[PDB]
Enzyme design. Structure first.
Site, PDB file in Angstrom:
ATOM      1  N   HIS A 227     -34.008 -17.295 -25.848  1.00 30.52           N
ATOM      2  CA  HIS A 227     -33.159 -16.314 -25.136  1.00 30.52           C
ATOM      3  C   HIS A 227     -31.927 -15.833 -25.909  1.00 30.52           C
ATOM      4  CE1 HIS A 227     -30.690 -19.656 -23.101  1.00 30.52           C
ATOM      5  NE2 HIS A 227     -29.796 -18.897 -23.715  1.00 30.52           N
TER       6      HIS A 227
ATOM      7  N   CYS B 293     -25.743 -23.707 -25.226  1.00 27.90           N
ATOM      8  CA  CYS B 293     -27.171 -23.527 -25.499  1.00 27.90           C
ATOM      9  C   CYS B 293     -27.506 -23.843 -26.945  1.00 27.90           C
ATOM     10  CB  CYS B 293     -27.642 -22.149 -25.102  1.00 27.90           C
ATOM     11  SG  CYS B 293     -27.480 -21.972 -23.336  1.00 27.90           S
TER      12      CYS B 293
ATOM     13  N   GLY C  75     -22.042 -21.111 -24.260  1.00 24.48           N
ATOM     14  CA  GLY C  75     -22.005 -21.399 -25.681  1.00 24.48           C
ATOM     15  C   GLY C  75     -22.678 -22.692 -26.061  1.00 24.48           C
TER      16      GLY C  75
END
EC number: 3.4.19.12
Lengths: 306, 5, 306, 5
Positions: free
Chosen positions: A41, A145, A143
């Site tokens: 993503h 991820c 942030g």
């Protein structure tokens, strides 16, 4: 003595964090040999999040659409593919600090360390368990991820989690390093919820064994139970049913402390029914289901305080 | 809905 | 969201652990530049522990009495001196992985990460606070001596603790990297005890601010207090008295959440008096005094869930 | 007494 949530030292993993940027999104990625994994993503935005299609969104991208940074240095992509929910980006450099490693899929109840990262820059390390509903009780902001979870045997890193998202209840969802989600979850933006969770019976019993190994006994009793009578009690109190394989797993710890399991299930049954009676076990006033039997073996003493 | 972090 | 005990990543420190052996005792030591620090009690045994004298026990030793090992590799001593409770061993090699670093003496209430080590080999990382009675609630077995505690600002390691011993209550005692003990304690073997401890008021309030920042409010109330009325309540419940400097420190967090401190002291006063009322704060059923205000700032969100 | 670890 002492018993604390202990994470694995995080050095070997810190050497594999990198920053990955595509357009206006930045998140952390994982750099082993000449590959860099990250959530798919990363290539997404606007409503691109509500109804995306990654096969489509990805074909409209090239290798130089990805700016992987490694400190102040910089890596160039030369290949890319999607694997289920992750991107696999081949790069020009191979990681000089690549540790021996492998990828495993942990099961509910197992535990691992999390290295929390922002902009490819490691900020902190905590221990966490896979919850029966397949989510973790992490601590992440935006942030985070691409932050990964891992165990270490000897000198070898077993990667088991990569962080992707925060559910409405404030718990986290991610995938193994193969791209497969834990849980029913998807990297779309819909009305998703965590299914109702359950206390991890195997672990609480591992914990009580540690309380004993440390040298406290107050919760014991003269009684015993059949598996079946416990599970009937357990079910109500929202515990996972206990099984023979679980009972077998509490083997050695029975041995080291000389307490039979079904005897501890009785102890447990009692704690469920009587409450804590205003005292602590191993410092806590609740029952702690995030230590496995293996975690108790590793951290606790080889000999009992009898 | 949910936050994709 | 989420709030967990978070330790600092431990890579920079793992690169400084070494094994130090003198006769029949082995313990971990800390290798910065061309120096290796470790507990002075590495040179000790028999009754050598009940009534020792290190000025005496140390003069009967030479540089090659110390076998410092660094992995499978090996370092040779070329100098040695005692500093208060530590040995300072000069060596032939200078540490290629030496990080930027400094040595500080933390104060009661401050927190830090611990890297637990056996035989110069790092096994695990946890967070811990300096308890008002100057001990920590660590998790160590025999062989853990020389394990260090530390914080990281930016890229710089502040060493603050080196582990030396376990008190009869099962809590730990050690020293800064200058050799000075925290607490009244000594590296002899006598009838020593931990003085009675106290809950760290500043921290519990920092914690409640985080519970709010995460987005829970149930413990608030319409009341307020004077410092003085709180301290009269606090004293009984065994809390440290709160002071203006503490109140000032809860400044920004007041600002970010729009809750005045003395207002939270009222909340606290109430929680002390009413008990938890059968629910949780930020997952816990007790009041958590091992998060500083700085720890809440760092880990928690920059914006409030209002 | 106490354990010097």
């Amino acid at each position: 003595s002492g018993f604390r949530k202990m994470a694995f030292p995080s050095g070997k993993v810190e050497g594999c964090m990198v920053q990955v940027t595509c357009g206006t999104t930045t998140l952390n990625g994982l750099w082993l040999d000449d590959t860099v994994y990250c959530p798919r993503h990363v290539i997404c935005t606007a409503e691109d999040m509500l109804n995306p299609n990654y096969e489509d969104l990805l074909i409209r991208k090239s290798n130089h659409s990805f700016l992987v940074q490694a400190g102040n240095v910089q890596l160039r992509v030369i290949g890319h593919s999607m694997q289920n929910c992750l991107l696999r980006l081949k790069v020009d450099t191979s990681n000089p600090k690549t540790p021996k490693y492998k990828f495993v899929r942990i099961q509910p109840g197992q535990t691992f360390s999390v290295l929390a990262c922002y902009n490819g820059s490691p900020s902190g390390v905590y221990q966490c368990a896979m919850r029966p509903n397949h989510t973790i009780k992490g601590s992440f902001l935006n942030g985070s991820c691409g932050s990964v979870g891992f165990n270490i045997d000897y000198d070898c890193v077993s990667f088991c989690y990569m962080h992707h998202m925060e559910l409405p209840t404030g718990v986290h969802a991610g995938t193994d390093l193969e791209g497969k989600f834990y849980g029913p979850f998807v990297d779309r933006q819909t009305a998703q919820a965590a299914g109702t969770d359950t206390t991890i019976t195997l672990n609480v019993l591992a914990w009580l064994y540690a309380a004993v190994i440390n040298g406290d006994r107050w919760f014991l009793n003269r009684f015993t139970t059949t598996l079946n009578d416990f599970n009937l009690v357990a079910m109500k109190y929202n515990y996972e049913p206990l099984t023979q394989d679980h009972v077998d797993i509490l083997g050695p710890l029975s041995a080291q402390t000389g307490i039979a399991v079904l005897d501890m299930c009785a102890a447990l049954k009692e704690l469920l029914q009587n409450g804590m009676n205003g005292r602590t076990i191993l410092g806590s006033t609740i029952l702690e289901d995030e230590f496995t039997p293996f975690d108790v073996v590793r951290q606790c003493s080889g000999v009992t305080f009898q | 809905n949910s936050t994709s972090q």
